Structure formats: structure tokens, C-alpha cells
Amino acid sequence: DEAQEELAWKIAKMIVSDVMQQAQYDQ
Amino acid sequence: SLRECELYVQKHNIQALLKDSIVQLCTARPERPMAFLREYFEKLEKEEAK
Amino acid sequence: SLRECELYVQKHNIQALLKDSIVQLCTARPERPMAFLREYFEKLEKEEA
Ligand SMILES: [Zn+2]
Ligand SMILES: [Zn+2]
Ligand SMILES: [Zn+2]
Ligand SMILES: [Zn+2]
Ligand SMILES: [Zn+2]
Known part of the structure; x- marks a missing residue:
């Protein structure tokens, strides 16, 4: 369960990175 | 902008x-x-409504 | 399991x-x-089904 949440955090931080990147490419 | 997006992400968790x-x-x-x-x-929208 | 979660996440984009x-x-x-x-x-759902 904590394993799950730990993994969800990792993935969420990944998405946030890719979001910031795509937001520099557009403006 | 890129800074407005970063800000929004932070402020709204x-x-x-x-x-x-x-x-x-x-x-x-x-x-x-x-x-x-x-x-x-x-x-979640319904929670934040009532 | 955790591996099933990682897998699902990758498989389903x-x-x-x-x-x-x-x-x-x-x-x-x-x-x-x-x-x-x-x-x-x-x-996106409406075009899923
Ligand atoms: Zn502006
Ligand atoms: Zn705001
Ligand atoms: Zn707000
Ligand atoms: Zn309003
Ligand atoms: Zn299983």
C-alpha cells in the first residue's frame, strides 16, 4: 500500500516534469 | 506562460x-x-460543491 | 501488486x-x-466508447 503511494508519487512527479517541459515549448 | 503554469500547479496542489x-x-x-x-x-467535483 | 500497477500504467499510456x-x-x-x-x-470518455 505504501509501496503503491510511493510509486504514484514517482509517476506524478514524472508527469509534472513533462508538463513543465511541454509548457516551455508552447510559451 | 511557463511560470503561470508552475504557479498554478503549486497553488492548487x-x-x-x-x-x-x-x-x-x-x-x-x-x-x-x-x-x-x-x-x-x-x-471530487461534487465534494467541492456541497 | 506494484508491478501490476507499473505495467497497467505503461500499457495504458x-x-x-x-x-x-x-x-x-x-x-x-x-x-x-x-x-x-x-x-x-x-x-475523451465519449470517444472511448
Ligand atoms: Zn498571461
Ligand atoms: Zn491560482
Ligand atoms: Zn484557484
Ligand atoms: Zn466563478
Ligand atoms: Zn494480482
Whole structure:
């Protein structure tokens, strides 16, 4: 369960990175 | 802008929002994740309304 | 298990799916993030089925 949440955090931080990147490419 | 997006993410805890949605997704592993995400946010919208 | 979760996430392109919704979210910057994401996925849902 904590394993799950730990993994969800990792993935969420990944998405946030890719979001910031795509937001520099557009403006 | 890029700075406005960063700000928005921070101020509205979007990162934690994603985390919770992924946690749910992995518990359910739905045939149809869009339908599931729809219902998940619909549920949360209703909380933030009443 | 955890591995089934990682697998599901990769197999179903979950990361890009969520990322795309947040990118839209960052453009709109709604006063109601939940409502927006709800509407966002409702639209993608309708083309899922
Ligand atoms: Zn502006
Ligand atoms: Zn704000
Ligand atoms: Zn199993
Ligand atoms: Zn706000
Ligand atoms: Zn208003």
C-alpha cells in the first residue's frame, strides 16, 4: 500500500516534469 | 506562460491530485481509464460543491 | 501488486493521458480544477466508447 503511494508519487512527479517541459515549448 | 503554469500547479496542489488519481487508477485498473477518471473527478467535483 | 500497477500504467499510456489533461489545465487555469478535469475526461470518455 505504501509501496503503491510511493510509486504514484514517482509517476506524478514524472508527469509534472513533462508538463513543465511541454509548457516551455508552447510559451 | 511557463511560470503561470508552475504557479498554478503549486497553488492548487495539482501534483498531489495526480498522485491520488494514479493511486486510484492502480487499485482499479479499469477496462476504460477515461470513463474511470471522469467518474473519479465527477465525485471530487461534487465534494467541492456541497 | 506494484508491478501490476507499473505495467497497467505503461500499457495504458496513463502517463501521457494524465499529462495531456494537465497541460490543458495549465492553459485554462480554472477556478475549479476538479470540474475542468471532469469535463476534460468526459469528452475523451465519449470517444472511448
Ligand atoms: Zn498571461
Ligand atoms: Zn491560482
Ligand atoms: Zn494480482
Ligand atoms: Zn484557484
Ligand atoms: Zn466563478
